Design a protein around this ligand. Structure first.
Ligand SMILES: *[C@@H]1O[C@H](CO)[C@@H](O)[C@H](O)[C@H]1NC(C)=O
Ligand SMILES: *[C@@H]1O[C@H](CO)[C@@H](O)[C@H](O)[C@H]1NC(C)=O
Ligand SMILES: *[C@@H]1O[C@H](CO)[C@@H](O)[C@H](O)[C@H]1NC(C)=O
Ligand SMILES: *[C@@H]1O[C@H](CO)[C@@H](O)[C@H](O)[C@H]1NC(C)=O
Ligand SMILES: *[C@@H]1O[C@H](CO)[C@@H](O)[C@H](O)[C@H]1NC(C)=O
Ligand SMILES: *[C@@H]1O[C@H](CO)[C@@H](O)[C@H](O)[C@H]1NC(C)=O
Ligand SMILES: *[C@@H]1O[C@H](CO)[C@@H](O)[C@H](O)[C@H]1NC(C)=O
Ligand SMILES: *[C@@H]1O[C@H](CO)[C@@H](O)[C@H](O)[C@H]1NC(C)=O
Ligand SMILES: *[C@@H]1O[C@H](CO)[C@@H](O)[C@H](O)[C@H]1NC(C)=O
Ligand SMILES: *[C@@H]1O[C@H](CO)[C@@H](O)[C@H](O)[C@H]1NC(C)=O
Ligand SMILES: *[C@@H]1O[C@H](CO)[C@@H](O)[C@H](O)[C@H]1NC(C)=O
Ligand SMILES: *[C@@H]1O[C@H](CO)[C@@H](O)[C@H](O)[C@H]1NC(C)=O
Lengths: 198, 222, 50, 88, 149
C-alpha cells in the first residue's frame, strides 16, 4: 500500500498514451478518420478542407498532451528536489527538524532503490512508559538559588534527585551539577533541600 | 521623487570594542498562508450542448476530451482535499486544556476556544472569519473536512503545545509546567534559566501586551 | 423567451415598466407573468453526478 | 446528507474511522448480516493530560522504530514524431 | 454554426482547465510550505534564521482561517546595548585562559566574564575558563588575575 505514487505515475502515463492513441482515430468533424480513403473518394478541393480539419484537431490534441506532460514534469521535478534535499540533509547527517525524517527523534536513515523512486528507512527514537514525579524550579540551601546545569529536579516523595529530562537516571544533588544565580527571594516555588559538597 | 533604500547607519567598528545587550522585549508576529481552494466541477454536455441532440451527435465525434477534463477536475479536487488533510490532520489523539488555568502570568484567552457559539472558535479565529468575505452545468463540491473539524484540530494542537510543549509530537505526551517550558525555550537560544526565573513577570506582561496589540491590529485593519 | 426550470413564487419587486430580470451573470432568472402581475423565479431542477 | 442524497445505507449514531469518504464529514463502511452504514467520522480519541504546576513525566524506557517513506524521483522519457503522428 | 460554437466552447474550457491546473499547482506548493512550517515550528523549536518569525524563535500557536492558516510567532529580540572593551584571553600565570562559555567584558578599570545576548557580570575564576597554551601567540591578550576558590 506504500507504493501508491510509483504505480499511479505509470498508470497516468499509460492512460495519457492510450487517450492519445484513441484521439488519433477520431473524425474531428469529417466523413472518415482514414485520410487516404478521403482523398481517394472525394475531390482535391474538399480533400484539402478535410485534411486541414484533421490536422487542426490532431494539433490541438498534441498541444494538450504537451501541456499535461509539462505540468507532470514540473511536479516530478519538485518531488525530485524534495527527495534530494531529504537525502542530503538526513542520510549524510543528523537533522534536528521535527517530523522531517521519521516520526520522533532521528538517529539514522538507510537509502534504498525503487523503480522511478527512492525508499527511505528512518530509524527513530521513541520513548516508552512514563512515570509521574514532582518538580521544583530551584533549590535553596544557604540562601542562594541553585539552578541545575543540564537536567531537572525530581522528587520521589521523600528525597530529591537530578536527572536528564529524557530518561529516569536519578543522581545525587551536589554543587557540581548546579550553579548559584542570586538569593531565594524572586524564584517562585524554590524548595529547601540539602546540596552535597565534594 | 526617487525611492530611498533606508537610513545611513555607521557601526563604530573597533578591534577592542563590543556591544552586549542588557534588556529584552518579546514580540509576537503573524503570517498568512493559503491551504486549499474551492472544489468546482464543470459538465461537458450541459455547458456545450444545452438540451440538443444534433449538438451531442457532433460532439461525440471530437474524441473523449470530456473524460480528460473530468479526470483533471477530479484530480484537482482530491489534491485540494489532500492538501488540508496533510496540513491540519497531524495529531493522533485530540488533546484538551485542563479546567484550572494554572499558567503563571500567561493568559491564553484570545486563542483558546470559547464555549458560547455553535461553531466553537476563538476571538482571533472569529475575526479572521469575519474579515474575509447551478446555471450552465456548474456545481461546487463541498469539502471533506468542515470548519468545525479544522477548529477542533487547531484547538487540540494548541492545547498539546501549551500543556506538553514539544513532547506530544514524538510519541506520548508528557505533562510539564509552562514556566519550565519557557525556561527550556530560553536555554535553547543561549540565554540561561535565571534570566526567566526572575523576569517571568515582565515576560508575561510583554506577551499579554503583544497579544493585545496583535488583536487590535487584526480588528482595526482589514 | 425560452428555457427550462421550475417557476417558484419569489419576492423580487420589479418596476412598473420592467418585464424581465437578470443577475450579475447576465442570465434569465425571473420573468413577470403577462396575465397577472406576479413575479416568478426561474431556477433549473436537480442535476448532478451519480 | 450534506453532500447529496444517499439511498441504500443506514444512518448509525456511532462514530468510527472514515473508511470511504463521502463529503462534509459523512463516511461509509461495510460492517455488521452486514450492510453499508452511514456514520460521521471521528477526529480521533479524547485525551486529557493532567496538567499541574508541580508535575513532570520522564520516560523510563525506550523502543527503536523504523518507518518508511517512498517518494518518486524520475518520470518516463517519451518523445513523439510530429509528421508521423499528424500526417501518416 | 453548431460545430463552430462547439470548437469555441472547447477552446475556452481547455484554457480554463489549464489555468485551474496551474493555480492548483501553486496552491499545492503553498500548502506544502504551510505543512512544513506547521511541522517544524509548532511541534518544537526551530533554529533556522528568519524562518518562523523575525528573531529568535520560542514558540508558535496555530490559528484557523478560511481556506488558509495563520501562525503566531513568539520571537525574542534584543534591546538597548552598551559599549564595552573586550579581549581574546587573559594571561595571569604565564598562561592563556580562554572563556568556556561567555565573553570577556571589561568595566573600564576591572575585568569580568559575561555571556552573549545578555549582560550578566561574573568573576573570572578557574571554573569559567580553561587553560591552553602560553601567552606568545594570542594577539590582544591582556593581564589579569584568575581567582582560585
Ligand atoms: C525515594 O528514594 C530514596 C532513595 O532511593 C529511597 O530511600 C526512598 O525510600 C524512596 N521513596 C519512595 C516513596 O519511593
Ligand atoms: C502551584 O499551584 C498551587 C495552587 O494549588 C499553588 O498553591 C502553588 O504555590 C503553585 N506552585 C508554584 C511553584 O507555582
Ligand atoms: C527555606 O528557608 C528559608 C530561610 O530560613 C525560609 O524563609 C523558607 O520558609 C524555607 N522554605 C520552606 C519551604 O520551608
Ligand atoms: C526592559 O524593558 C522593559 C519594557 O519597558 C522595562 O519594563 C524594564 O524595566 C527594562 N529592564 C531594565 C533592567 O531596565
Ligand atoms: C485574560 O484576558 C481577558 C481579556 O483581556 C480577560 O477577560 C481575562 O480576565 C484575563 N485573564 C486573566 C487570568 O488575566
Ligand atoms: C386577464 O383576464 C383574467 C380573467 O380571465 C384576469 O384575472 C386578469 O386580471 C386579466 N389580465 C389583465 C392584465 O387585466
Ligand atoms: C500519572 O500521569 C498520567 C498522565 O497525566 C495520568 O493519566 C495518571 O492518572 C497519573 N497517575 C498518578 C498516580 O498521578
Ligand atoms: C524496555 O522495553 C523492552 C521491550 O518491551 C523490554 O525488553 C525491556 O526489559 C524494557 N526495559 C525495562 C523494563 O527496564
Ligand atoms: C557606542 O559608541 C558609538 C560610537 O562611538 C555610539 O554611537 C553609541 O551611542 C555608543 N553606545 C552607547 C550605548 O553609548
Ligand atoms: C565600574 O566602572 C564605574 C565607572 O565607569 C565605577 O563607578 C564602578 O565602581 C565600577 N565597578 C566595578 C565593580 O569595578
Ligand atoms: C587595535 O587597533 C589599534 C589601531 O588604532 C592598534 O594600535 C592596536 O594595536 C590594535 N590592537 C590589537 C590587539 O590588534
Ligand atoms: C603582561 O605581563 C607581561 C609580563 O609581566 C608583560 O611583558 C606585558 O607587557 C604585560 N601586558 C600588559 C598589557 O600589561
Amino acid at each position: 500500500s506504500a507504493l501508491g505514487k510509483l504505480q499511479d505515475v505509470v498508470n497516468q502515463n499509460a492512460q495519457a498514451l492510450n487517450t492519445l492513441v484513441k484521439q488519433l482515430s477520431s473524425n474531428f468533424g469529417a466523413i472518415s478518420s482514414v485520410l487516404n480513403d478521403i482523398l481517394s473518394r472525394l475531390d482535391p478541393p474538399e480533400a484539402e478542407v478535410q485534411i486541414d480539419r484533421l490536422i487542426t484537431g490532431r494539433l490541438q490534441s498534441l498541444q494538450t498532451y504537451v501541456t499535461q506532460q509539462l505540468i507532470r514534469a514540473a511536479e516530478i521535478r519538485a518531488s525530485a528536489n524534495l527527495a534530494a534535499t531529504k537525502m542530503s540533509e538526513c542520510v549524510l547527517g543528523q537533522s534536528k527538524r521535527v517530523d522531517f525524517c521519521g516520526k520522533g527523534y532521528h538517529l539514522m536513515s538507510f537509502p534504498q532503490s525503487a523503480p522511478h523512486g527512492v525508499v527511505f528507512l528512518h530509524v527513530t527514537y521513541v520513548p516508552a512508559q512514563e512515570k509521574n514525579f514532582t518538580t521544583a524550579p530551584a533549590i535553596c540551601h544557604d540562601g542562594k538559588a541553585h539552578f541545575p546545569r543540564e537536567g531537572v529536579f525530581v522528587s520521589n516523595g521523600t528525597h530529591w534527585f537530578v536527572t536528564q529530562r529524557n530518561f529516569y537516571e536519578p543522581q545525587i544533588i551536589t554543587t557540581d551539577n548546579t550553579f548559584v544565580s542570586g538569593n531565594c527571594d524572586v524564584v517562585i516555588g524554590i524548595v529547601n533541600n540539602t546540596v552535597y559538597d565534594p | 521623487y526617487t525611492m530611498s533604500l533606508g537610513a545611513e547607519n555607521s557601526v563604530a567598528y573597533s578591534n577592542n570594542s563590543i556591544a552586549i545587550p542588557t534588556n529584552f522585549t518579546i514580540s509576537v508576529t503573524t503570517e498568512i498562508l493559503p491551504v486549499s481552494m474551492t472544489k468546482t466541477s464543470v459538465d461537458c454536455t450541459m455547458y456545450i450542448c444545452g438540451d440538443s441532440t444534433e449538438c451531442s451527435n457532433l460532439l461525440l465525434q471530437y474524441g473523449s476530451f470530456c473524460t480528460q477534463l473530468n479526470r483533471a477536475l477530479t484530480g484537482i479536487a482530491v489534491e485540494q482535499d489532500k492538501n488540508t488533510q496533510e496540513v491540519f490532520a497531524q495529531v493522533k489523539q485530540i488533546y484538551k486544556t485542563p479546567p484550572i488555568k494554572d499558567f503563571g502570568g500567561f493568559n491564553f484567552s484570545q486563542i483558546l476556544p470559547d464555549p458560547s457559539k455553535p461553531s466553537k472558535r476563538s476571538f482571533i479565529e472569529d475575526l479572521l472569519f469575519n474579515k474575509v468575505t447551478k446555471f450552465n452545468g456548474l456545481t461546487v463540491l463541498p469539502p471533506l473536512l468542515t470548519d468545525e473539524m479544522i477548529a477542533q484540530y487547531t484547538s487540540a494542537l494548541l492545547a498539546g503545545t501549551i500543556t506538553s510543549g514539544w513532547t506530544f509530537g514524538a510519541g506520548a505526551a508528557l505533562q510539564i509546567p509552562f514556566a519550565m517550558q519557557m525556561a527550556y525555550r530560553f536555554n535553547g537560544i543561549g540565554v540561561t534559566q535565571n534570566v526567566l526565573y526572575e523576569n517571568q513577570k515582565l515576560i508575561a506582561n510583554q506577551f499579554n501586551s503583544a497579544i493585545g496589540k496583535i488583536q487590535d491590529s487584526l480588528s482595526s485593519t482589514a | 423567451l425560452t428555457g427550462t426550470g421550475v417557476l417558484t413564487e419569489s419576492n423580487k419587486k420589479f418596476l412598473p415598466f420592467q418585464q424581465f430580470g437578470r443577475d450579475i451573470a447576465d442570465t434569465t432568472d425571473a420573468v413577470r407573468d403577462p396575465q397577472t402581475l406576479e413575479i416568478l423565479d426561474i431556477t433549473p431542477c436537480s442535476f448532478g453526478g451519480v | 446528507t450534506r453532500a447529496g442524497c444517499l439511498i441504500g445505507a443506514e444512518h448509525v449514531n456511532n462514530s468510527y474511522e472514515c473508511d470511504i469518504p463521502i463529503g462534509a464529514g459523512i463516511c461509509a463502511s461495510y460492517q455488521t448480516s452486514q450492510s453499508i452504514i452511514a456514520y460521521t467520522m471521528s477526529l480521533g480519541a479524547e485525551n486529557s493530560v493532567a496538567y499541574s504546576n508541580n508535575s513532570i513525566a520522564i520516560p523510563t524506557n525506550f523502543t527503536i522504530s523504523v518507518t518508511t517513506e517512498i517518494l518518486p524521483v524520475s518520470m518516463t522519457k517519451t518523445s513523439v514524431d510530429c509528421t508521423m503522428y499528424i500526417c501518416g
